[PDB]
C-alpha cells in the first residue's frame, strides 16, 4: 500500500530535505543550513555562498567529448568541461542516447558535472577522454618549454608528456601514469602544422589508440595528414603501434579527427565491423551438459556492406542422424551442419566430454546489422541458442558528433540536423539580479531571460489540419521531415507529433551553417499514414539570401520568376500538406528547465526554497 | 564561519600552484619550477576540504546536544508542573480532613 | 545618491573590506572596475631580473596585468594572468611614465 | 564524508613527490631535483593516515 | 508612436508605409512598421 499510494500521491513522501540525485551545493547548503539557530542573515550568506557554487557550475564550458558506441544514437556520450580560473578546473558529466527518443534528450538522459580531483595543465587544449573496459580514461598532453633567450648559448628544450588518468569506483581519479611522446610531436612540430589528438578505444584488440595528426582543412582519404602514433595497454605499458597499422587506423576513422574549424567528437574505434557473440554457452540438462560453443571468429569485409565470416562451432557435451549444427539468418539457413557428415575425429564413448569440431564455417552476408543465430540441433528436442549480432560502422558525416561555439559564449551538441544546448549564460545576466537582492534572484523575470538560438538557424511555425482519416490516413500521426542538408538530398526524419483535432501548430527550429542546403535549399514536408507529400514544392522551401542575411520561405504564394539560392527558378507552387508556414523572426526560448543544466535550475528555483 | 573560511583557502592554494609552475631561474640555467605543486595544492585542498566538514560535524553535532538539553528541560518542566498540582490537590484534601 | 547637496551623509558610505587576494602592484596602477555589477580589480605587476654584468648580461623584464573579482560570498576570484609585456615594453622605450 | 575524503590525497601527494624527482634546471647548471621528495610524500601521507 | 516630453516626434500606423501585413492564419500577428529615423537635440532624453 505504501508503494501504491506512492505511485499515485507521490506528494505524501516528498520531503525537500533528501532527494534522489540531488547536488553536492544542494548538500552544502544543507549541511551549512542545519543548525538551530537560523537567522536572516546565516539563510542569506548561505544562499550567497550556495549561488557561488551555482556560478562556478553555470560557467563551465566543454572542450571535448568521447561518444562510447558504434553508433551515436545508441550510447552515451562522456563530455568533459573547464571553468574560468586560470588554475583550470576539469569536470566530466555523461549524456545517454537511449533516453533520446527523436532528436532531443529529456533532462533524465543528462548526468550531473562531476569535478575531477586530478589537477592538470593541457598544452593547447589537447584533453580526451576515453571509454576502455567501461572505465572512464582521461588522456591529455602537457608540454615543458624552457627557453633561454640569449646568443651565448641559446638553450630551447620542450618536453610534451601524454598523462592518463582513469577514475576508481569510489569517484577518486587514478595517479596519473606519464608517457614521453616529445620525439612524436616534435617530428609534427618540425613541420609546420598544427597537432590534432584522437583517442579511442579498440575492443577486438584489447588496447586504446592514440594518434597525433596535422590539422588540415579536410581529409580526402589519398592525402593522410601528418601523423605519428601510439597504442597502450591494459597494463600501463607503450605498445609500438607500425606505420602500416597506423595507416589503416588512421583511414579508419578520418571522419572523427579535428579539422582546423569544427570539433569532433571521437567515437568507439572498429575499422568495419564488430561482432557481438559469446563462446560458450551452457544447457545443464538433468542427463547431461552439452556446452556447446563458438572458439575463434574472425571476421573480413571484402567490399562496402558485405562481410567473411570464419568461426569453428562445436558441442562439449559431458555426462548421427542426431545432433546438428545450424547457422541462421532472420529467416535464411546460412550454413547447416551435421555430425556424421564432414566431421574429422568423432570423439570416442570413453571420453566423458565429447567434443565435436565440425569444419571451418565460411559465409558471405551482406548488410549492416546482422543478427545471426548459430543453433547446435541437439534433437530426439534441445536447442542450443548462440547469436553473433554483426554490427557495421557507418563512415558517414552523420555519424560524428560535432560540437560548437558561438562567438556570443553559447555552445552546443550537433548530430546531424539536431542541435542540443550544451552551456548556460545564466551567470552572465546572475550578478545583476544578485546585487540586488536575494528576491530578484528568485524572480519570475529571472526564470525568464533570453538565451542564445544554438548556431546560425532560423524558426518556423507549421500550422496543421485535422484528423478526419482521409488526408491522414489511420494512425493518427504527422512527421515533419527535412530534405537537403548534406550531400544527402532525401527524406529525414526532422520531427514527430501525434496529430490532434481542429488546429494544432509547432515552431521548430531549423539549422543553417552555410555549407548545407543543397539544391534550392531544405525542404520540410509532412508525413501521414497517408501518402506523404513533398512531390515537387509540395514541401516547405527556405533559403538563405547572403545579400539581405536573412532566411526567406519560397513557397507562399504560387510564386513565378522567384528567387531560390541557386538561381531565379521558373514556376514555385504552395507548400502542401500545411495551412500556413511562416518564419518566426528571433523566437526566444527562455531557459529550458528540460534541457542539459536542468537540474540546476530546478535545485535553484524550487529546491532551494523549499 | 571557521566552517565556511576554511573552504576558501583552495583556490588560493591553486594560484600559489599556478605561479610556482612558470619557471623562476633565467640566463645560462634555463629555469627551476617545481612540477608537483598542482598536485601539492589539490592534495592540501582535500585536507582543507576534509576539515571543513569534520568541523562542520561538531557544529552540528553541539546544535544537536543543544536541543537534546531543551527537551529534557521540557521533562523536567512538566515533572515539576504535575508535582506541584499534585501539591495543591493533597492540600485540597487536606482542608477536607 | 545620498549626497542631496554636495556634502555625504555617513549613511552613504560603506565599510572598508579586505580582499583576501594578495597584491603586489607595479607603481600604484591598480585600478577598479565595475562590470556587470560586479567589482572587478585590475592591477599590474612586473617581475625584473637583472644581471648586472658584462660577460652575459641579462636583462628582463615581464609586465603582467593581473584580473580578480569577488563573488557572492565575499570571497575574491583567483586572479586571471595576461601577458601585456609587450605594451608596457613599448610604452616604456619611449621615454614615458 | 571526512574519514573517507581524507584518505584520497595521499596518492596524489605522491604525484607530487613523483613529479618533483625529475630535475628542473637545465643549461650550465645541470639540474636541481630535490630527492626527499617522495619520504616527505609518504610520510605526510601516514599522517593523513 | 513615440513622444518627447510633449512633442510627438514619429506617429506610425499599420495600413499605412508598413510593408508585409501579416495574415490572420498566422496566431503571432508582426507588423514591422518601418526604420525609423529622428533628430533630437539635448542631453537627458525621456522618450516614450
Redesign the interface.
Given at each position: 500500500a505504501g508503494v501504491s499510494e506512492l505511485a499515485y500521491y507521490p506528494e505524501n513522501y516528498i520531503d525537500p530535505t533528501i532527494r534522489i540525485g540531488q547536488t553536492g551545493m544542494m548538500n552544502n547548503l544543507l549541511?551549512?543550513l542545519?543548525?538551530?539557530?537560523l537567522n536572516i542573515d546565516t539563510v542569506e550568506?548561505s544562499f550567497?555562498?550556495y549561488?557561488?557554487a551555482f556560478?562556478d557550475v553555470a560557467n563551465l564550458q566543454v572542450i571535448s567529448g568521447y561518444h562510447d558506441s558504434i553508433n551515436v544514437n545508441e550510447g552515451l556520450t562522456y563530455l568533459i568541461g573547464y571553468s574560468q580560473?586560470?588554475?583550470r578546473?576539469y569536470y566530466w558529466r555523461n549524456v545517454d542516447h537511449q533516453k533520446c527518443q527523436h532528436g532531443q534528450f529529456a533532462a533524465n538522459a543528462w548526468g550531473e558535472w562531476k569535478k575531477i580531483?586530478?589537477?592538470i595543465?593541457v598544452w593547447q587544449e589537447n584533453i580526451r577522454p576515453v571509454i576502455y573496459k567501461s572505465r572512464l580514461y582521461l588522456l591529455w598532453l602537457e608540454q615543458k618549454e624552457?627557453?633561454?633567450?640569449?646568443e651565448?648559448?641559446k638553450?630551447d628544450?620542450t618536453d610534451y608528456i601524454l598523462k592518463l588518468s582513469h577514475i576508481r569506483y569510489?569517484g577518486?581519479w587514478?595517479?596519473?601514469f606519464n608517457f614521453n611522446v616529445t620525439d612524436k610531436i616534435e617530428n609534427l612540430i618540425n613541420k609546420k602544422a598544427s597537432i590534432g589528438m584522437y583517442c579511442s578505444s579498440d575492443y577486438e584488440k584489447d588496447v586504446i589508440i592514440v594518434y597525433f595528426h596535422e590539422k588540415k582543412d579536410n581529409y580526402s582519404f589519398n592525402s593522410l595528414p601528418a601523423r605519428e602514433g601510439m597504442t597502450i595497454n591494459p597494463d600501463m605499458t607503450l605498445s609500438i603501434l607500425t606505420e602500416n597499422d597506423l595507416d589503416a587506423i588512421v583511414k579508419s576513422t578520418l571522419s572523427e579527427l579535428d579539422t582546423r574549424t569544427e570539433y569532433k567528437v571521437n567515437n568507439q574505434f572498429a575499422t568495419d565491423y564488430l561482432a557481438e557473440y559469446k563462446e560458450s554457452i551452457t544447457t545443464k540438462n538433468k542427463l547431461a551438459s552439452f556446452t556447446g560453443n563458438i572458439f575463434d571468429l574472425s571476421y573480413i569485409s571484402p567490399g562496402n556492406g558485405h562481410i567473411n565470416l570464419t568461426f569453428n562451432p562445436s558441442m562439449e557435451i559431458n555426462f548421427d542422424k542426431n545432433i546438428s549444427f545450424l547457422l541462421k539468418n532472420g529467416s535464411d539457413i546460412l550454413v547447416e551442419l551435421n555430425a556424421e557428415d564432414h566431421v574429422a575425429s568423432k570423439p570416442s564413448h570413453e571420453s566423458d566430454p565429447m567434443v565435436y569440431d565440425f569444419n571451418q564455417v565460411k559465409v558471405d552476408i551482406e548488410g549492416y546489422d546482422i543478427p545471426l543465430v548459430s543453433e547446435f540441433i541437439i534433437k530426439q528436442d534441445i536447442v542450443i541458442e548462440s547469436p553473433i549480432h554483426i554490427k557495421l560502422k557507418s563512415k558517414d558525416t552523420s555519424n560524428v558528433i560535432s560540437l560548437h561555439k558561438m562567438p556570443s559564449g553559447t555552445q552546443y551538441m550537433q548530430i546531424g540536423p539536431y542541435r542540443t544546448r550544451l552551456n548556460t549564460l545564466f551567470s552572465?545576466k546572475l550578478?545583476?539580479r544578485?546585487?540586488?537582492g536575494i528576491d530578484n534572484v528568485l524572480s519570475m523575470e529571472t526564470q525568464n531571460l533570453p538565451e542564445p538560438q544554438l548556431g546560425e538557424g532560423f524558426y518556423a511555425?507549421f500550422?496543421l489540419p485535422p484528423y478526419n482519416k482521409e488526408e491522414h490516413g489511420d494512425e493518427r500521426w504527422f512527421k515533419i521531415h527535412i530534405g537537403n542538408i548534406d550531400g544527402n538530398s532525401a527524406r529525414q526524419p526532422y520531427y514527430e507529433g501525434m496529430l490532434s483535432d481542429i488546429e494544432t501548430?509547432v515552431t521548430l527550429f531549423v539549422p543553417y551553417a552555410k555549407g548545407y542546403y543543397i539544391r534550392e535549399g531544405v525542404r520540410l514536408g509532412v508525413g501521414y499514414k497517408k501518402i506523404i507529400y513533398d512531390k515537387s514544392w509540395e514541401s516547405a522551401f527556405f533559403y538563405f539570401d547572403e545579400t539581405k542575411n536573412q532566411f526567406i520561405f519560397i513557397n507562399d504564394a504560387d510564386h513565378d520568376s522567384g528567387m531560390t539560392q541557386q538561381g531565379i527558378v521558373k514556376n514555385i507552387k504552395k507548400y502542401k500538406g500545411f495551412?500556413?508556414v511562416?518564419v518566426?523572426?528571433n523566437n526566444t526560448e527562455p531557459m529550458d528547465f528540460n534541457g542539459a543544466n536542468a537540474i540546476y535550475f530546478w535545485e535553484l528555483f524550487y529546491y532551494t526554497p523549499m | 564561519s571557521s566552517?565556511?573560511l576554511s573552504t576558501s583557502g583552495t583556490?588560493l592554494h591553486?594560484?600559489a600552484?599556478?605561479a610556482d609552475?612558470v619557471?623562476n631561474i633565467?640566463?645560462?640555467a634555463?629555469?627551476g619550477s617545481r612540477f608537483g605543486a598542482?598536485?601539492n595544492?589539490?592534495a592540501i585542498g582535500?585536507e582543507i576540504s576534509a576539515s571543513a566538514?569534520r568541523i562542520?560535524a561538531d557544529?552540528?553535532s553541539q546544535?544537536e546536544i543543544?536541543?537534546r538539553r531543551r527537551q529534557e528541560w521540557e521533562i523536567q518542566r512538566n515533572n515539576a508542573e504535575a508535582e506541584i498540582k499534585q501539591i495543591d490537590a493533597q492540600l485540597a484534601t487536606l482542608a477536607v480532613r
Open positions: 549541511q551549512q542545519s543548525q538551530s539557530q550568506d550567497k555562498n549561488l557561488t556560478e580560473t586560470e588554475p578546473i580531483e586530478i589537477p595543465n624552457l627557453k633561454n633567450e640569449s651565448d648559448g638553450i628544450i569510489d577518486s587514478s595517479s596519473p552572465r550578478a545583476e544578485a546585487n540586488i511555425t500550422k501548430t495551412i500556413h511562416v518566426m523572426k | 566552517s565556511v583556490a591553486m594560484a600552484a599556478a609552475l619557471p633565467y640566463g645560462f634555463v629555469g598542482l598536485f595544492a589539490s582535500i566538514t562542520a557544529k552540528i546544535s543543544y536541543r
